[PDB]
Design an enzyme around this catalytic site. Structure first.
Site, PDB file in Angstrom:
ATOM      1  N   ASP A  97       0.850  -1.187   0.000  1.00  0.00           N
ATOM      2  CA  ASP A  97       0.000   0.000   0.000  1.00  0.00           C
ATOM      3  C   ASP A  97       0.888   1.240   0.000  1.00  0.00           C
ATOM      4  OD1 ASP A  97      -2.003   1.844   0.168  1.00  0.00           O
ATOM      5  OD2 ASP A  97      -2.739   1.219   2.142  1.00  0.00           O
TER       6      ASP A  97
ATOM      7  N   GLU B 180      26.010  14.694  12.233  1.00  0.00           N
ATOM      8  CA  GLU B 180      26.284  14.615  13.664  1.00  0.00           C
ATOM      9  C   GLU B 180      24.944  14.548  14.390  1.00  0.00           C
ATOM     10  OE1 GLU B 180      28.534  18.272  14.371  1.00  0.00           O
ATOM     11  OE2 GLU B 180      30.250  17.374  13.332  1.00  0.00           O
TER      12      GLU B 180
ATOM     13  N   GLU C 178      22.566  14.057  17.540  1.00  0.00           N
ATOM     14  CA  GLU C 178      22.463  14.198  18.982  1.00  0.00           C
ATOM     15  C   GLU C 178      21.135  13.616  19.448  1.00  0.00           C
ATOM     16  OE1 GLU C 178      22.922  18.451  19.534  1.00  0.00           O
ATOM     17  OE2 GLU C 178      25.082  18.353  19.167  1.00  0.00           O
TER      18      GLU C 178
ATOM     19  N   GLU D 264      27.046  14.917  25.073  1.00  0.00           N
ATOM     20  CA  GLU D 264      26.696  16.239  24.583  1.00  0.00           C
ATOM     21  C   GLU D 264      26.485  17.175  25.781  1.00  0.00           C
ATOM     22  OE1 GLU D 264      27.128  17.296  21.376  1.00  0.00           O
ATOM     23  OE2 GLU D 264      26.659  19.145  22.470  1.00  0.00           O
TER      24      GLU D 264
ATOM     25  N   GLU E  29      25.928  12.217  21.444  1.00  0.00           N
ATOM     26  CA  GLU E  29      26.135  12.491  20.031  1.00  0.00           C
ATOM     27  C   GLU E  29      26.919  11.351  19.401  1.00  0.00           C
ATOM     28  OE1 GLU E  29      27.070  16.484  18.744  1.00  0.00           O
ATOM     29  OE2 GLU E  29      28.664  15.750  17.427  1.00  0.00           O
TER      30      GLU E  29
ATOM     31  N   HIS F 168      23.663  18.292  12.877  1.00  0.00           N
ATOM     32  CA  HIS F 168      24.592  19.039  12.043  1.00  0.00           C
ATOM     33  C   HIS F 168      24.931  18.221  10.806  1.00  0.00           C
ATOM     34  CE1 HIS F 168      24.528  21.713  15.261  1.00  0.00           C
ATOM     35  NE2 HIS F 168      25.814  21.867  15.522  1.00  0.00           N
TER      36      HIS F 168
ATOM     37  N   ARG G 235      31.045  29.607  16.199  1.00  0.00           N
ATOM     38  CA  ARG G 235      30.235  28.393  16.137  1.00  0.00           C
ATOM     39  C   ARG G 235      28.769  28.699  15.879  1.00  0.00           C
TER      40      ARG G 235
ATOM     41  N   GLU H 262      29.249  23.118   7.174  1.00  0.00           N
ATOM     42  CA  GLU H 262      28.376  22.498   8.164  1.00  0.00           C
ATOM     43  C   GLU H 262      27.141  23.366   8.356  1.00  0.00           C
ATOM     44  OE1 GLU H 262      29.574  22.881  12.211  1.00  0.00           O
ATOM     45  OE2 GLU H 262      28.994  20.829  12.739  1.00  0.00           O
TER      46      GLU H 262
ATOM     47  N   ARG I 286      23.947  23.874  10.627  1.00  0.00           N
ATOM     48  CA  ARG I 286      23.723  23.512  12.021  1.00  0.00           C
ATOM     49  C   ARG I 286      22.273  23.638  12.473  1.00  0.00           C
ATOM     50  NH1 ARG I 286      25.546  26.420  15.577  1.00  0.00           N
ATOM     51  NH2 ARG I 286      26.595  24.965  17.001  1.00  0.00           N
TER      52      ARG I 286
HETATM   53 MG   LIG Z   1      28.939  20.478  14.821  1.00  0.00          MG
HETATM   54 MG   LIG Z   2      27.221  18.971  19.347  1.00  0.00          MG
END
Ligand SMILES: [Mg+2]
Ligand SMILES: [Mg+2]
Ligand SMILES: [Mg+2]
Ligand SMILES: [Mg+2]
Ligand SMILES: [Mg+2]
Ligand SMILES: [Mg+2]
Ligand SMILES: [Mg+2]
Ligand SMILES: [Mg+2]
Lengths: 444, 443, 443, 444
Positions: C53, C131, C133, C188, C195, C244, C315, C332, C334
């Protein structure tokens, strides 16, 4: 007590009896009791110009939009309530609902009964009604909410309860008499904690007003003594349900037109026609006399409630019964309704059906002097004995295609009543009840 | 391997160390019936049959006894997928005979056999692949069934992922141990709801497997601390459990529902089979949906069919045509629930379709719209009728149906109807807590 | 353990005693979907495909069925990291086709494949390392998930050190046993938060692994008494969970983002790729952050970015350039959280970056200042916009986006938006206990 | 398994199977299973000189004084019990009870059945019996005591239970087969948690021994799996009770004397006389077949238990039923007894009554092919259909004045049985039950 006739009568009584708030009283389409409070200082202007209020409150829970409406207070309906707050006395008053354009609102059930009375007056008849209201007296839980916990284990006509419930039961009777109800009799009924109060045999419009007043007066007084008064048709399985037997008769020229000294049963030909009309149309408005899903847990064989359409003079278990009393007390008793019905609509339709029988000379057929519950389907089919609708859905379907009920109720009440009951049934039919889990969860 | 003879079964009993043989049959209402035979009596049982109380087939409407003889069918012998401490267990089916020597016509399995016979007279055999949906609930502190959930997953979710992941796997592995040859197993729409799709096979074999499936799944779940429920609607507000019945007719190797030359690639006889099914489905809904709870599933808004129609595109029709063609061409009837007797349900489905083929019953134009979205006025304009709204209405529709009476036989017909009427009269007088919640404070 | 052909799969099924095969796919909203196939039927499945289905892919907004076929890809065969007593279990993926033979455009995996296909038109192939988490919580007495903490550790803490130390090790081992090639795993920022960093691999294979990761970690934790949660923000006042996504483009075997002679050693195409990401990110935040709870993570004051910017130093920017250069040069993104559909999220990231290279979209100057430390008027001058502040705002930005509609297709686009709107209309009407705590006594 | 004939057979089997304890097996007058343990080392001397024991244990709870008695072990009754303790195997053995003067003790119920067998042998008959024992499977409470808590909610012939109760149910069947019981069938019965095991149709003395063995074997095995096996006639109100249907037939010259190929029903004249004797005397020993106060909560109309004295070939709800099987399987089924009865006394009295019918050529009258439960007292009186005793007191009174039961049981068993049952009834009739408090405490 006293009898008020003019607005000046009521205004005087407000001052001398220290009445501080007036409660209006009316019902929605489904019979739910509606009210709002007016300060006594406002009362004199209320008699002069009326009171604007949201008339969509009459539609029930199917109200879509607001609708400004006027309530013209009726001074003769002013009655002081049987409790005495320290602040001041309280009274109720009824009235007539008018549209902004000045015409009466045809959607008020009280108006519907009034036009049924007008049809009787055209043929020279006035109708008297004596209802027998059954109710249950239950205990409240620790939080004050209603339960089905019994207050006694007594039976028919027992002198029960004899504990503190004896006092609340007596308080109910005293307060009804304090309002001038002129109760005929009150006794214990068949089921445990079940009770009956027999109304005075009187005018239908006044009696219908009293039925609505009766319900919230009994509930409020029971509440303040720690008890709950239930008007459910069948709150408990396996014991009797609560009905509203409706005794009725027609009068013309101050004489009872149901009585004939010459005939064998001492009943006139009009009474026969009146019974015939009732039997012809009862299926079409069972949804009005038995208006909730619970009504048909009472309309099952074996517990004094009639499920077969018949009339008789001897056995009570017929749908229509003739009491022994003759002369001015001659009446016919319809035993299907329950106290959940709207009295204005139920009494109006009984009158219209009976009047339809008289004007069309509808023969009621032979009476059935045997207990129909002892018969087969074949024996019942042989005598052509039909059943009442077996559930609210069936009663709705019989009412949906009735030209008679539509004419007697009017289009507004007719559609609004049916639409509300259909939503009620659609909600009920989808519920998965615990009974189904008990029977099927282990088995399937 | 495959068992064909009483000698095949008897040596397998020695070779696999079978100690107990359980018979397997159903009463009129579909309740699974059984009794245990020691393996050492199996030789005498094949030679003379087994006397038993045939009143067990009546259901709870049995009053008197009736001695009856069960003649074991060696080809139905199958070893159950659990290994007790001392010896394996196996089940077997058979044909029920009266003491006078005639077959007992009240056996639901016999009813399906006569329907198979009717199709054979016309040169057809019926293949059935049923889709069985069930709920996996946990047990309470005393091991009693509840409706308390084991996961919150949805349609085709990889759930549950806790210990319930193991019992779901155990159920699938047990059916494969028995030679079921499952096509698919997956999570259904409601939380804790699961579905297992059977192989597409002969109707008599499939109906036997549906009965076996029910107690095998229940026993495996029970012994892991869970409960498998085949209630049509154990919970309000979520999907119910149905038993979709994909079916097809074959004329000695060829699917008679397939036709390469028509636009839809369905044959004329497939159209007639649908017509007969639509013409009679109201008359035996009480068989496909046999309990009061069945009609809490047949309510609008949950992809259970309520209206009588067919389509090739819309799934929510009463009869659906899957896309597959050629040998796999089939039609799917989606109203039945797993509470129904598969013998009676499949038999009436077959007869209704056979009647459609015999009488050239046009099924009408397919309803390619959602009938749910339409208003009641359009439904009347299109002439769309509804399935019975509760068991009482289904009882009344079946009561005056010549077609159902002839197909079931008057024994099953009256016994089935009498049991269902007693069930309804008990239900209709109950005061439910819903009524107290709504009316106790209001009236 | 490298599978290429159907014969490779069939021999490994026989040698490793695999009894059940689980299909693996996702619906439009990223929920993992599956159904079980007994291994005996696997050879037929490779030859003919498996009918199922297809409305299961559509999400919870499905009303009608749609028969579809899954063509199994033998190179995605992989044995699951738990060992039932009955036998081994394996997963397999595939492509979904309509009955007419055309690929079903509504499969999110197909949506990713078209973005890969458009990237190959320009000679680009995309590699991704996500990445992921997640939170490790306790189960209550009934085995239900809770938010009860399993440790109080912080960033890169060697915690937990109780029995939770063993489940975290079991999770890492199970992934390694399945060929994931984890790069690193660590604690983390928030308590009980963890993570796991994937190997840098091709986008299609990586996206399939993100789906497999989720139910493997879930199942392993469940069977040890713990719950693995992929909610963005299960707990107020502590860090949320992001996914990430480090990404890079390759052409002719060399990294497209690397340039040895540029000041930052970042190529012009790397700048263009960021520009396309910055230009379109607001239009598909509803895909990278798909649930209502996602925007409780996208609030200022934590690791999650709420301002559209890029930098090589800060960051807390939406896009960050890691210091790694050469073949490992990557960018990256985020903002995504592990609730997103990886197929749809990676496809839109690739398309947005590709549109940057096609249209030479300048990304502007990098924001090397902590934007959180700025006034609203400061960000106004520097042209710093913010992400949508709730799901409803993200829906509206996606509703009127030609880029998102073309990249997903009009069917995925419509169904995704309709489900998310129903989601918000349910949430927006809820009266929350916080409102009761704040207003009941006040008003 | 194996068949032992000599004492040397048993002594060998004790060594090779490591049997450590031998349990004697007998019953008291009321059917309570009695036993004592003998170490296997003592067994060889037991076969040589017998075993002294307190024979007042046979009297029941009406034992007044001790009575030294000898048990002569019967090697052919040696059977190994179906549980295997780590210490060693366990076996049971039966025997004959002798007085110190060397005469057999006439008070042993097993002796009573044996003299009934001797009366049959005088007329050339041997009697075969197949009993159908119904029992309930209940849960134990937290302290290991029996309750009436259900283990399943299944019905007649259901495949229930399917939880851990499926295993104990299968363990019971396996252990009976492990002892050579040769079970015919076992299935679920009508009531929830109710089960039936059908014994092999065999010799009455061997079968009666097996019924006693069956009870403690099922109870012990259920106990060790956490369940309780109940042989109460009616442990639960509103559902079926447990009966012990007793199929029986006579044999002479290895031929079934109940079968006649020539007669219409294919039943011989001896079978008719045998039925007549059973119908003539059944009232006089209902106290033996239905021995406890609870027995007559099962002997009430409406639950498959027969309360009217009649015979028929078609409907089961008769007191005596003829199964369809003919030829060597021809038998008559007596359906009144419950598993609380002493099998030795019940089978002996059935045989004696049937033999009395044959020797006096007692006509059984017409069969009653209608369901007697559908008849009035007048219709029942018109056909002369009598009832079984309505309670234990009535059955005691019918047994007290029966010359037939006294002769068949012997004076010692007769008085001891009646005296015990009278004390049982006197204790019961004085008890104030909770049902009386529920009905009367509020009302009076
Ligand atoms: Mg990162
Ligand atoms: Mg982290
Ligand atoms: Mg009354
Ligand atoms: Mg009355
Ligand atoms: Mg399904
Ligand atoms: Mg289907
Ligand atoms: Mg029985
Ligand atoms: Mg029997």
């Amino acid at each position: 007590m006293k009898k008020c006739t003019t607005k000046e009568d009521v205004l005087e009584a407000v001052k001398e009896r220290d009445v501080k708030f007036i409660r209006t009283q009316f019902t929605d389409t489904l019979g739910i009791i509606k009210s709002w409070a007016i300060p006594a200082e406002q009362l004199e202007e209320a008699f002069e110009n009326g009171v604007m209020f949201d008339g969509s409150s009459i539609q029930g829970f199917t109200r879509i939009e607001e609708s400004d409406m006027k309530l013209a207070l009726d001074p003769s309906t002013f009655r002081i309530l049987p409790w005495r707050p320290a602040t001041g006395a309280v009274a109720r008053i009824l009235g007539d609902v008018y549209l902004p354009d000045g015409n009466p609102f045809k959607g008020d059930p009280r108006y519907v009964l009034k036009t049924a009375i007008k049809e009787a007056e055209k043929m020279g008849f006035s109708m008297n009604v004596g209802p027998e209201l059954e109710f249950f007296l239950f205990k409240l839980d620790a939080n004050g909410n209603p339960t089905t916990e019994l207050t006694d284990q007594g039976g028919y006509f027992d002198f029960a309860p004899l504990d503190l419930g004896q006092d609340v039961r007596r308080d109910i009777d005293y307060a009804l008499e304090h309002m001038g109800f002129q109760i005929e009799a009150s006794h214990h009924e068949v089921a445990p904690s079940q009770h009956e109060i027999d109304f005075r045999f009187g005018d239908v419009l006044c009696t219908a007003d009293n039925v609505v007043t009766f319900k919230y007066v009994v509930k409020s007084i029971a509440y303040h003594k720690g008890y709950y008064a239930s008007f459910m048709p069948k709150p408990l399985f396996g014991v009797n349900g609560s009905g509203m037997h409706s005794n009725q008769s027609l009068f013309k020229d101050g004489k009872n037109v149901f009585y004939d000294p010459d005939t064998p049963t001492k009943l006139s030909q009009d009474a026969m026609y009146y019974i015939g009309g009732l039997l012809k149309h009862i299926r079409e408005f069972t949804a009005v006399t038995n208006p909730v899903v619970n009504s048909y847990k009472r309309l099952v064989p074996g517990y004094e409630a009639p499920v077969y359409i018949s009339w008789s003079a001897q056995n009570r278990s017929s749908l229509i019964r003739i009491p022994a009393t003759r002369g001015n007390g001659t009446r016919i008793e319809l035993r299907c309704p329950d106290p959940a019905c709207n009295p204005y609509l139920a009494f109006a339709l009984m009158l219209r059906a009976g009047l339809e029988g008289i004007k069309n000379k509808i023969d009621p057929g032979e009476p059935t002097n045997v207990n129909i519950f002892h018969l087969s389907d074949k024996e019942r089919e042989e005598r052509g004995i039909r059943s009442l609708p077996a559930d609210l859905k069936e009663a709705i379907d019989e009412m949906k295609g009735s030209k008679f009920v539509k004419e007697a109720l009017g289009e507004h009440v007719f559609s609004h009543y049916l639409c509300a009951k259909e939503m009620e049934w659609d909600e009920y039919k989808a519920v998965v009840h615990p009974w189904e889990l008990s029977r099927y969860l282990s088995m399937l």
